[PDB]
Design a protein around this nucleic acid. Structure first.
Lengths: 227, 80
RNA sequence: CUUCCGGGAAACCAAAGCUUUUUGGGCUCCGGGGGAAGUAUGGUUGCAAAGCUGAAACUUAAAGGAAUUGACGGAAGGGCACCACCAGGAGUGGAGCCUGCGGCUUAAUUUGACUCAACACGGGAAAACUUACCAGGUCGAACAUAAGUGUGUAAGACAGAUUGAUAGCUCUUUCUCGAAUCUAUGGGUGGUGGUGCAUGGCCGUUCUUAGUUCGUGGAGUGAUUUGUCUGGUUAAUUCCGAUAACGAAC
RNA sequence: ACAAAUUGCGUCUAGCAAUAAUGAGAUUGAGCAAUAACAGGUCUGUGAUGCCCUUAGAUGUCCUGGGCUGCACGCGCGCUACAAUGAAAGUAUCAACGUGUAUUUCCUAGACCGAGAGGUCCGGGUAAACCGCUGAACCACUUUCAUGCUUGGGAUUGUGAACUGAAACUGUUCACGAUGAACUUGGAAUUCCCAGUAAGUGUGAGUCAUUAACUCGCAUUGAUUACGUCCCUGCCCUUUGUACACACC
């Protein structure tokens, strides 16, 4: 049971419901705005587990007298090469986590996993070393050989067991109790791994189809073709 | 044993008896004359409103029947 | 000034940047939770005031930085209303009396309520009843057990005591409908008994108001803001109109 | 007023103007009320209730009493005053909201008697139909008074006569003829309110065996003054400040 087939709202998710794109990294190929989580329910959803990290309450001082709203964290990662992070405040803990798992799905980004020192057999850790700072915590991911698992604090070890990164070295400076700045620091470190010009990426591409060009007919038609 | 605040233990000793039973045996006291006349100890009620099954009292010069202990006072009161 | 399209915890900074991912242009001075304490003591300089050097015993879990949201709470600028004045009018506060609350006392003077938002309130205008308080009284209420057996286990009145009234409530002496076997024992039962600072409910005021919120965006690491505003006008978050989602919602 | 109502147009839009109507210059007050809250109040409104306490010897319960009313005193709501605009006598002669008895003593018409208080006798009425055309009060109209704690003012205490009810005693209330005190406009402080309103003036209902002296509604008589402003106590998320937690107590 769906029970509701998603409506194509943007022109991008028009095409995945009409199946004109059948590869998730095509929107990563041109860095599209992935602004419906109903996109990634098509491509993935098989093998996409949610874990929360904290349901940190937060308060405001009204004149009589306080008011609590809940900044629940959630973390989704396809178990090899895609990771996301979700944060939202609302009046109930249910209406955070029923909607936090949305906000992690929208920001799901691809991981580059690279060989540590000897290119044999499905690369695992990280191609380079990456720091992601989000406000005074900065986790410094480092490769490691095969068979030494994720050494970190227990929180971003959960950010990397679900990222597909297999054997990583980490070191985190700063106020590492602030969980928002310790999830996002690693999230801004994992996602970096495809934004660093390793010398393996010099020969370029044919440089484009830009699928609003490749499928300009189906967006020219106003008829909502089914399936 | 209740609880209060100001006034406790007036205690009129709460002596209320149930029934002393120091007298008034059930009428095993009776006698029949042999063949065949009977003597009715506590001879019965002459009041015609009952079936004369009361064993009317032996007392001082005021007696009474058994269906009503206060009334049927043996004085006798004459009506004329 | 404008911005990072650099950094930062931020406020910010054209350096407070190139402090990159365990980073490197030289060089020197300085900091290591807060106090104790720039104290104590020694040296040294000064006419002196004092300056430079400078601890510890002890004490302690926070102390501190920057920023958000709480005061259209003694700060500006707005905008209302007679539980605000002002221009008054009538008033009470004075007098006697009815009450209300206290304090007093008493056997008890049952009590809840104490600024607006307790006080001719609790609809609380009570001889009894109410009545919760005070004195005298009075009533009894469950069962399996159980022990008289039905040789009266009971229950009722006279009569003289006890009474406030006949309360055979109790009783001197009397007859009696006798059985729910009237049980010490389960323990439920009532309660105007306690806690409104354990609660439900309603109601009160906060607030005569005009004020709140949500998804979707851009704002921030974040608390949180934006929408929900500059102005004009309105009784008004009522509307034009800047129109930073709105079609919104109360 | 069912508002293009015209009006040297305000940011082309919400330029007051009183001007137009001639039942109508709102006929016009109420109810209604969000989010977040308070250790507000209510366990004594409830068979709403946690828990606590108690139960033949009750805090439960019915009876007879008592009290809740008692007093050197303090405090608030409120009553009639402190008088010639008045206190008396007379006459004239306007309401409205309402309410009223068949498992409870209501509304009372009529005659009659009684200083009165009331009482008797006989009706009406379950109510647009009877009480009831409720023919309300203050005020209007001639007089007595001649400001003199007076005839203003009726607390105060005797006495009997009464009513309602088992029962009236800092009293259940009510009648008469006595008793005439304080009180002469009330200090500092201080409340209320803008049109039929304020205040004066009654009446009904609510409780109620009888008891308003209070609370809700009703009508009558009917003003002064503002038509404003933010000094005042005020209150509303605009800006800014902070070392403020339970937030300037």
């Amino acid at each position: 049971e769906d029970s509701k087939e998603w409506v194509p709202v943007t022109k991008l998710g028009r095409l995945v419901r009409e199946g004109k794109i059948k590869s998730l990294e095509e929107i990563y190929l041109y860095s599209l705005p992935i602004k419906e989580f109903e996109i990634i329910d098509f491509f993935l959803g098989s093998s996409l587990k949610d874990e929360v990290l904290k349901i940190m309450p937060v308060q405001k001082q009204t004149r009589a007298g306080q008011r609590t709203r809940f900044k629940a964290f959630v973390a989704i990662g396809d178990n090899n090469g895609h990771i996301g992070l979700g944060v939202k405040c609302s009046k109930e803990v249910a209406t955070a986590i029923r909607g936090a798992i949305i906000l992690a799905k929208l920001s799901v980004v691809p991981v580059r996993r690279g060989y540590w020192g000897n290119k044999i057999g499905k690369p695992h850790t990280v191609p380079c070393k990456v720091t992601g700072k989000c406000g005074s915590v900065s986790v410094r991911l480092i490769p490691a050989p095969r068979g030494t698992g994720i050494v970190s604090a227990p929180v971003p070890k959960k950010l990397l067991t679900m990222a597909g990164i297999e054997d990583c070295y980490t070191s985190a400076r700063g106020s590492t109790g602030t969980l928002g700045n310790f999830a996002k620091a690693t999230y801004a470190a994992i996602a970096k791994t495809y934004a660093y010009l390793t010398p393996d990426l010099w020969k370029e591409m044919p440089l484009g189809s830009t699928p609003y060009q490749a499928y300009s007919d189906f967006l020219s038609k106003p008829t909502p073709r089914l399936h | 044993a209740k609880k209060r605040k100001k006034k406790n233990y007036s205690t009129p000793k709460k002596i209320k008896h149930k029934r002393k039973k120091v007298k008034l045996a059930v009428l095993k006291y009776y006698k029949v004359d042999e063949n065949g006349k009977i003597h009715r100890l506590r001879r019965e009620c002459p009041g015609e409103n009952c079936g004369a099954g009361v064993f009317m009292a032996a007392h001082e010069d005021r007696h009474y029947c058994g269906k009503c202990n206060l009334t049927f006072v043996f004085s006798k009161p004459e009506e004329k």
